[PDB]
Amino acid sequence: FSKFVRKNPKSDKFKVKRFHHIEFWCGDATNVARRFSWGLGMRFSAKSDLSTGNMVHASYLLTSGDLRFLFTAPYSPSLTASIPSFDHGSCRSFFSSHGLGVRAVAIEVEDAESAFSISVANGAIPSSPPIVLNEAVTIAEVKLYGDVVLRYVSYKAFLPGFERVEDAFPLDYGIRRLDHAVGNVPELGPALTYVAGFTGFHQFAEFSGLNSAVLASNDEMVLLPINEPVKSQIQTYLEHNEGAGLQHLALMSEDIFRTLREMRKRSSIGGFDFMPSPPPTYYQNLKKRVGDVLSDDQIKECEELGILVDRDDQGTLLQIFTKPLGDRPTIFIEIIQRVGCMMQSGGCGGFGKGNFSELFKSIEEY
Amino acid sequence: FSKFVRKNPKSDKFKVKRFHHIEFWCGDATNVARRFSWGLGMRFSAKSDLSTGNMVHASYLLTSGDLRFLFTAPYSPSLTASIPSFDHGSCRSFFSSHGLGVRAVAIEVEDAESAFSISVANGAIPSSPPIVLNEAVTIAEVKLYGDVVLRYVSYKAFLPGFERVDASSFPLDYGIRRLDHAVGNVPELGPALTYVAGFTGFHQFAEFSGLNSAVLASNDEMVLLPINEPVHGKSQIQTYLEHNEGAGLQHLALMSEDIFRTLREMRKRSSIGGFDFMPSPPPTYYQNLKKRVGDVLSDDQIKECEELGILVDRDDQGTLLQIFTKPLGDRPTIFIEIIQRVGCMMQSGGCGGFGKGNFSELFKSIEEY
Ligand SMILES: CS(=O)(=O)c1ccc(C(O)=C2C(=O)CCCC2=O)c([N+](=O)[O-])c1
Ligand SMILES: CS(=O)(=O)c1ccc(C(O)=C2C(=O)CCCC2=O)c([N+](=O)[O-])c1
Ligand SMILES: [Co+2]
Ligand SMILES: [Co+2]
């Protein structure tokens, strides 16, 4: 009776691959990284600070699976830098106006020199030219939205100037990669026009107080949703963050029950807090909608963990959200596990849009 | 046939009680407060942030016994505040230029209204005049060294504005009970002691590498404030001074009712968010312990020091267990000291000293072969 048809022109203007890393910018990178390390279960595995010769910034790298979080903070200008786009004047201005937040959204491409030239010839505002690192890595950044940039990394074979680390049954709760990354802007329209203009990402098709549109690369493994405000928590983000900027990171986990039992045990001891949980009638209503996909016990396991379930035409998406990460109510994190389109299709299950109404309906029915 | 003689003129110019709290100025206090809380074993007790109506700064207060560690970072000017000494321009420049560190070292007093008037009269530079909060508490701040301020907290009989924190069954506790002392790094010791002692009346508490130290003390000798200058000809005092961009607080000793229970808990967490300690002394260091502190510790308590990297020193009055963490933030500046003092029971302040005999004991032990 029902059918949902999707288009994919594959209009990528240059060839991209995968999410590479995210770069948090902060004031003291050691504590943000040691916090996030115990909350998310990410192994400290590369660094570039004083003990490595870097007298410009302290950059630490947390890895879990392929997911790579880089934490960067400036030292005193009175004092070698491995990241060629770093600057005290821009980093101090970033953190003053926005607080703890994502500075770069980084994606592996075939060639960063071309990826940047084609971008800038297609409307992209440049933020950092192509710089070859030790004849091994190329790095370039164009403005994405607000003071967030889209960062192109390319190889010929973490980064030059980084040392390795391995010592900590090390930290691993099941997080395996970055699924999608989300910004908020004032006016979605011009933002979609800009971004899709210089990348050729096609709009992804989905099944209160925001309007959402999702860009995807040719393989739809580089997903970028964007939200505009229609009270509206999108509007609250823009005020506290002082402009456009990134809203959440969704982390793909190989077992969302493993990940969640770990991250809820640590909420009150340095880890991360979560949204208050749906009413029990939300989970009583699961069997009627996804009981062909989740066994009763896994349904039990979602109620026991506050885990949201939605599905669209292809598969089913399990998701739960944290509270804000630092001071301001701005950046939160989303933990997701996608089930269904096994080949795994990018975006299997969508992004959770269905849960707004399905959560309202569960509230009303006791 | 030796005796160490201590004088105590008890020259306090006002009446001071104990250490009250330490305030770290941050950029994002949530991750620092949470890092410290898991790392030291201190409970979340109060807040003053957006959730409670404060829209100028976020402050999260961690306690553990009597130790009170307050964490404050500024919001955006575009947005209620419970600490009348705060400033966005002051907190930005404090964090741009010194990194994460101590802003204020706060002491309880009979009257902060009078502690300030006397201090300013004897040289001390005023930083925040006395301000009564909800007609219940009074707060004032005079410049200590660099951008540290000495802060006076007097009661009529955590603070006004703070919402008390929620429960998690048996919250964190590794044994830390109070702030023993709060050490400073100055370029010149002389002008340091003259200025501080000139306005506090605190007296030189006598002691039994590349630095010179003098310990300043109130009439009960329970508020302790050692001060350090560098000796040139390398010096960690001088290395502090460059990364900190001037004078500032160098370390906090955290008294613990069982240093082993604290170092067992803390060392378990070093690589899962916690704190890291300096490399442990050679094993000859501890073979030497029997003959200098065997009359105070057992054979099993000298083993527990080795299995833990703990250092032992003693005075004419008592013995001093101590261990040191690596620098708590990005910059190589402020660190934390975990100590527990044995003896001087009536417990006195400055039982066992401050560890100054451990420079040569460590160096002596290092000559293994
Ligand atoms: C109302 S809810 O089910 O809790 C809920 C459900 C889904 C999301 C989701 O992350 C967002 C997507 O990434 C991109 C499109 C908009 C959107 O909604 C959120 N959200 O993070 O705002 C909340
Ligand atoms: C030789 S040692 O064991 O490393 C060692 C032993 C004692 C201390 C001690 O806490 C300090 C005192 O409180 C004040 C005097 C200066 C000083 O040295 C430290 N320290 O400055 O970290 C190191
Ligand atoms: Co999402
Ligand atoms: Co000390």
Swiss-Prot record, chain B:
Its cofactor is Fe cation. GO terms for biological process: L-phenylalanine catabolic process; tyrosine catabolic process. GO terms for cellular component: cytoplasm. It catalyses: 3-(4-hydroxyphenyl)pyruvate + O2 = homogentisate + CO2. PROSITE patterns: VOC. Binds 1 Fe cation per subunit. Belongs to the 4HPPD family. This is 4-hydroxyphenylpyruvate dioxygenase. It comes from Arabidopsis thaliana (Mouse-ear cress).
